[PDB]
Specification:
Chain lengths: 325, 325, 325, 325, 325, 325
């Protein structure tokens, strides 16, 4: 028997669909206990996913992918990734006589090396595996494979991928490193710039951003409970957050504009009425409309942010390997 | 039972009439999907005609005839043509006990080799097939088979054909390569000369030309929405277009003059009052009158551009094989 | 066979648990008889523990640890500590074929020198021995190894130890010298300040404190029978005692505040709802609530004083070496 | 003083002879540098001839003649041609008091328009200029001006020209577009058909063809070093090349047959014993003999391929204007 | 009067040449004193360049460019960059009546945003400024502007730039983030993997790498004096270092291979005999030869590492704006 | 007008410098007469400084700081400290229109409470006052603010302070309680251990120590005139004294080692060549060299004991507030 997988193996969240109807999401992160006590507390030699990030306190949490690309700045990060992947496959619940055929998404324009490392690292766990551009397999998740831009803004990477009809490209892709994560790093700097007394780690501003990110007009008051020398402080982050999230957008815009001019002229109009935002960063409030406005120089853009950014990635992959060799 | 066909198998549009009252037109073009995704998008292994040119984005559209002559610069282009032809016959709707007798038009003075390739390639689909000059079978479509010039200006080829009474000639024919398509290539160069920022492919200027082509006096403002680095730009193409379409005409004129002087002197006066333009290029605005003027040195020309350039080709063929063995 | 020990080797009270179910407590103190008559009275060449402190009159009682750290301000104090330790092991009742594995607590941030001197001095008596922070092994005694402060207020030392998850720290520890004992010294001075006729030694005020210590609101009348020029005098020590015990607290508070601001901001809220007081000084009346109030500037603290301050120290140690190499 | 020129102004090579004993050949091509860097690299504002084609990399090389006819699909191509022509005259080395009388060859049956454009464009550089059929001025180059066919196969055009005695014709000429260049386009398609991994541009297959072209029997192994995804690959092109170059020949043959039947019957036997191949395409291996065989239905052809295809064109022109007004 | 500048504004080292014969190099880094004492120690409100990195101890050293791109993850980093740039211009020594025309290099395929931020930020200091690809302005520094690859491996970025003749590209560029810095991060992880007791910061391994980096065969013993718990330790880093620096190379190779296949086939051979390494990372021992070997599948590469990696960057820029508007 | 003060407010000796050139030293101690006769003898209601310690016989001498920290184990000790401080300011000789700006040193890592109590208690006497780490203000007294350890060994406290560049730390400080005084206590015990007939108070051994303290090799005979049952006895204290003063050192060493491993590895070598001993305990004979030897495991230490331990403390403070707001 055969089981196929959609694995959008994201730098922060790995989503997974299976032919047999698992949707599940998890954090792409593996906790190791830090010492012999951690090991005790944790009750197992490592954790993966959201439990790891709950116990983030007393585990060394290791993201196995940053810049989406599967990491090798340590010989350890290979073992991490093994765990992660082992765990996502295992949490697909399959066997004993189940032949796992998988689709993995990566960042578009992730090197052959890194596609090979995944591919290898999957071909350790699943027998047959397939590595495609996230943004494309998004697009393929919506039948938008034609005269379309996607802009997966994610965490690690904003990928932007003209679906210049069907061939999923490698000059029709683009990736920026300015993505979610960089917004937080920034945001944090934007808050620490103005309430210099604050403690923020990035995991804080991460959450400020998730909760109040927007662009353009501030539609409300962005008030958040930070700490300062340990003391609770409520503070206004409207302006940090504005700044932060409208620091993604320049690059995305310019890099749509760039893809747009790659399409045949007869179709550019039509492309613009197909610009998509998928992935986390596509949940920014007012994004849509901020883009529209940024693109008026190219025409009437109709920008849409997908329905459920959480799975469109895998949804696609899945459908994709519902359908071939 | 017997069914006969008029197939004006043109380089850009293949028109077809049948004895049983199909008129239909289609683009002479066959799309293949480019990759395994295309194949999916397209829903079939190839398309032919105007759907192919809609999906031009993500299909490799292959015209199977350029210079009208049926192409062999690939072993593939034979299969293309098969598809085209298969499809035009099939869209004539005939069977199961229907013996297809066909007339195909070609460019006048298309080589015996090429007439044989069609003929062969039709005798694969229809049982009995007949390949004549387009311009003649136009002329035969209007009872102008005597002391007449036609000038089929088409896409690929302008053919020009003295209907030196009845024998349809091979020194009374002429073909130029400068035809529609060459107007576009040119036009495009004429626009890209002056708004060097523009993108044009030829399929754009094609459309500029269809929409604003004229000769002589510019009767209006030729304003068109081009792209520049992706940005919409409205621009004035009156002068490009003038230039472009009055780059057909020299050769046509000289080649009428040339046919004219082939006729017996007693009749040349009379010929001139019979010059015809058939085919697409005959839709140029002001053509008629521009020719008249070009021909004053030979006399009072009365130049006419046929009633419905779309079918006169096949109309003829049809009538033609309504009437013999 | 193997026997493991929890030895909370405190500066005033050494508690001990064994795997085989001894709990016992004793005073960390060894009496030597003062002279040849003492030796006679005492019936043995030294005592250890509460009998020593009964006979405190006519023995030279030598605490072998002050500031918890095991003392070397005499070459004698090494022999003392031997006796003490010899006696606590021996009162664990083990042999003849018993291999003693021990955990000893010290003050958190006791020097490597002093951990070595214990360690040595235990590795004289037990074969394998382990020296950890008291406060941690408390915390480990309550599964509170995460986002927790403990404050062991003891006699010698108040130790305060963030259980910044599991690694038991050395910037996440703190020790103050102001602890029990310093309260008494003080208290005494606070009583001798106002009833200057009184005799107090510290061993008196030690007992006033044990009996009436509180902080904040005086919940009752602190009347105690002191002497003056030998003459019994009952006197009111409510205000001495208030003063005395609320002279611990500043430092503790400031040093919790300090540890609190060491945790990641995302968790400080959570820490505060985990502040513990263990050890003797944690028996102060109203401590809990006085702390809560001192910490309102950091949030809603939920401060708890452990269930049985007497053993939580060793309890832990025990459990701790119930569980590894 | 007077200086006369043979200029065979070919679509790929322009040869030139002068009365004063220049033979030189050059590529009919003018490089312009592409940008402000090119301009720097090139050291001059344009190049012409073989240096242009060396620097083909970083120049926009523009052939100023395709289909031999002097191009006007750009207003630029007029300036190109100026450069070319300016340069071929200038490289004839003449002045200051030298009156240049020139013979240019064109494709036989190049329109009056195009003969006028050259003629004009020469009468800009030389004072008196003469435009004749290449094939004829070849024939005139060999005293074969009688009962002769030539077949200039060139690059752009195969011209074929009955030398129906002396009047050089315009129903005794013929030109096909299928010539050299079309062999390459084809060849390339024939190689890319079978080693679909290969890169070929036409400039490659051009070179495969020059190096291995033949017809009929493959006299050797046609092995050539192509690239595939950049990787060197040696591959066998014997069958591509067969296919390609025997795709010229049908049209040539049919068009000789056609000229042949134009001659008076008494002479056709004799004509056949005079069929010539001039020009590049006449260098195909085995051509001679392949034709012979193709023409057995007409008799014993004696087909010859001229001695030095490089100059016979101009050689003629030259001689030609060594001899009149 | 006019003064022009070559500013290779690198992420670690900014080199600068002026028309008037300054070469100088500095570290691209600005030290701010950390507190009111730092300010005192430092004697000025900020430092820039190598003094900043000497005083790295007690300054907050802020690189104003990482990933070469000029940073905006802080509103501060703009002021940094101002200082840096102010300082590099000022250390060009020019005025009072000197009009500074500059060339700045960036990473090839740095966004328009970032070219604008520099450009702006230069047009604050110099009046006219120009921002080009480092690798190109290298290539232009060696007349290698044709059928050439460069691979600037630097610190931040390895840029790899086909000099596909002269137009300096934006599909003919490539940048990787795996560059010097990433080697150190890695290396450090590679050493800390094996001598887990070691302290390394990256600034250590940075120096291990500078001193012992190689690839392929270890030509010697890589012994280095690290610290462990403060204690000097000499250790062997041959294998870490191997690992580390041969973790650049995959991406570079693949991305040459990729550029190579972008060139016209006729030239790829020739390209390969032009592959350059410029910039710091080009100082790796045995690089050359390791590449050669990696590229044997594409042919005989002749890889060269430039003469003086320190200035080729600016050298170029300089020459470049020695020569135009 | 403004007058600034260096007050190194030490637990045994308070040194003071003023801007106007007072150096003076005094004992940090206030004598009160014990009774109505003392009051008569003393001639004033209290003394402060060395007269108090002369009359130590018949005054109750109260150090107002032990452990350096300003004492509160009595409500009296606040009045003491007032007197002391009143007297050190007053002996700075300033008024009537003099605004006293002061720097007071404390033990590094003295609690905020205690810094506040001084601060308060100075802001009673001087208008503006500043409380910093002694060891830092030493270091600042020698420009050694960088990659330096100091070890102030004093009386109360040995402070040890990495001058981890400029920010004066609170994890880069350390204080031990084992300092001078603890040496004496010990020494005394070391002499009473061996000449059990002796009387020593600590004030005796204090003086033995001052006079004969050394470490390592005994460079001479330590003979001193003690009493026994009142009877003068000369006795050899070489071995007591060895023992005593080499009981400081372990902790200091371990706590340098500890700070050393806190510095960045690149600098630890360099730190070691900057280890300082300031303060009284730094007068121990052979200290320097004994440390060197203790630290060989970290490298070649170059340990220096400051020039004039008496004032380096205040010297600094002074300079310090010669230089700011
Ligand atoms: N509601 C939100 N608003 C803004 N950013 C968000 C939101 N939810 C998630 N993100 C950001 O988008 C990223 C998560 O999107 P995701 O599709 O998982 O990224 P990836 O799949 O590349 O890991 C993170 O950087 C996160 O902070
Ligand atoms: N001798 C060397 N061996 C290996 N890498 C080196 C060497 N010298 C410098 N580097 C590395 O190359 C980089 C410096 O090169 P550079 O041209 O200045 O980079 P950039 O200009 O992008 O700042 C750093 O990452 C450094 O560690
Ligand atoms: N010559 C000496 N040798 C050893 N210790 C000394 C000497 N002089 C003073 N001391 C000790 O050092 C301390 C005095 O140093 P000091 O800087 O005044 O300490 P503090 O300033 O902390 O009161 C006293 O403990 C004293 O016994
Ligand atoms: Mg994603
Ligand atoms: Mg037609
Ligand atoms: Mg205790
Ligand atoms: Mg020719
Ligand atoms: Mg560089
Ligand atoms: Mg001191």
């Amino acid at each position: 028997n055969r089981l196929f997988l959609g694995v959008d193996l994201g730098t922060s969240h790995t989503a997974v669909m299976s032919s047999r109807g698992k949707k599940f999401l998890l954090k792409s992160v593996v906790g190791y206990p830090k010492d012999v006590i951690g090991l005790k507390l944790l009750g197992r030699p490592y954790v993966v996913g959201d439990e790891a990030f709950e116990m983030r306190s007393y585990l060394d949490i290791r993201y196995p992918l940053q810049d989406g690309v599967l990491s090798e700045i340590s010989d350890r990060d290979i073992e991490v990734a093994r765990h992660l992947l082992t765990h996502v496959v295992k949490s697909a619940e399959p066997g004993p006589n189940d032949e796992i055929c998988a689709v993995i998404g990566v960042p578009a324009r992730a090197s052959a090396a890194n596609k090979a490392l995944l591919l290898k690292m999957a071909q350790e766990v699943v027998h047959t595996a397939l590595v495609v551009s996230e943004p494309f397999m998004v697009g393929y998740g919506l039948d938008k494979l034609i005269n379309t831009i996607i802009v997966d803004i994610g965490a690690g990477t904003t990928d932007i991928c003209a679906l210049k009809g069907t061939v999923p490209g490698p000059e029709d892709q683009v990736t920026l490193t300015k993505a979610g994560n960089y917004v937080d790093e920034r945001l944090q700097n934007a808050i620490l710039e103005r309430h210099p007394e604050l403690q923020m780690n990035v995991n804080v501003a991460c959450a400020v951003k998730e909760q109040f990110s927007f662009v353009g007009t501030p539609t409300e008051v962005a008030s958040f409970e930070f700490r300062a020398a340990g003391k609770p402080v409520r503070a206004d982050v409207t302006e940090p957050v504005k700044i932060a999230c409208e620091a993604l957008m320049p690059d995305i815009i310019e890099s749509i504009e760039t893809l747009l001019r790659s399409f045949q002229p007869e179709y550019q109009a039509t492309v613009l009425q197909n610009i998509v935002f998928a992935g986390g960063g596509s949940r920014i409030r007012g994004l849509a409309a901020y883009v529209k406005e940024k693109l008026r120089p190219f025409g009437d853009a109709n920008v849409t942010c997908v329905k459920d950014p959480t799975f469109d990635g895998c949804r696609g992959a899945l459908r994709l390997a519902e359908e071939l060799p």
